[PDB]
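Teaching note: in complex prediction, the entire set of molecules is handled at once rather than each chain in isolation. The prompt given to students was simply: 'Predict the structure of this complex.' The entities are:
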Amino acid sequence: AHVIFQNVAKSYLPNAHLECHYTLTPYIHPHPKDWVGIFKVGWSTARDYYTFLWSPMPEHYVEGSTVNCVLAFQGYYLPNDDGEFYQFCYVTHKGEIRGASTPFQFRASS
Amino acid sequence: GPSSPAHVIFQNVAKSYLPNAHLECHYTLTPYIHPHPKDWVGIFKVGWSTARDYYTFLWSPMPEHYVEGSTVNCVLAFQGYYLPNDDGEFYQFCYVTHKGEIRGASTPFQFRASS
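The expected output is the structure of the full assembly:
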């Protein structure tokens, strides 16, 4: 609950860029090797990612603050419509998960 | 029959990839294969005869907590400076065991700006 994923949909288009919004809550200090992964549900460790992007250190970070971030994942790194469920996970520089979103599928929407 | 036997299946393989951006290659180990530290995935021009014909390659990392008979998802990132540029040729991924045998191959693709 230390990193909250925001406005997470139930599905995302497979071949378009995805915009991942999240909040660095007061309960965590970011670190420049932190990253966000797209993980298939049922994952055990942080090495089980499908794709990832570095979460860039917030400019002029003041401790204990509340910061909202955006990451655009490119469509050609996203899964296809494979019926599987994926989620977002925030991973720190060491490898602890401190954020995990509701699941979602890549496919056309309702 | 067909070749190679599909002991490794490449997943979500696109029709084309960016010439100068890294690509992320996804494959699954089937219950037929027991992976080995010297297995690798190569990018091969279509029409390859043996594992010697590769364009570029990476070692396939040995999966953690490996249990025989399992289906295992893997991913490799090939750097763009090791990828073919827009040469009009067709390529595929192939999984090659340490015994030097091709045990999986993907659908073909070329390196160019996407449609």
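Point out the following to students. The interface with chain B takes residues 40, 44-45, 47-51, 76-77, 79-80, 82 of chain A (CB under 8 Å). The domain at 1-110 of chain A is CATH 2.60.40.2840 (Immunoglobulin-like).
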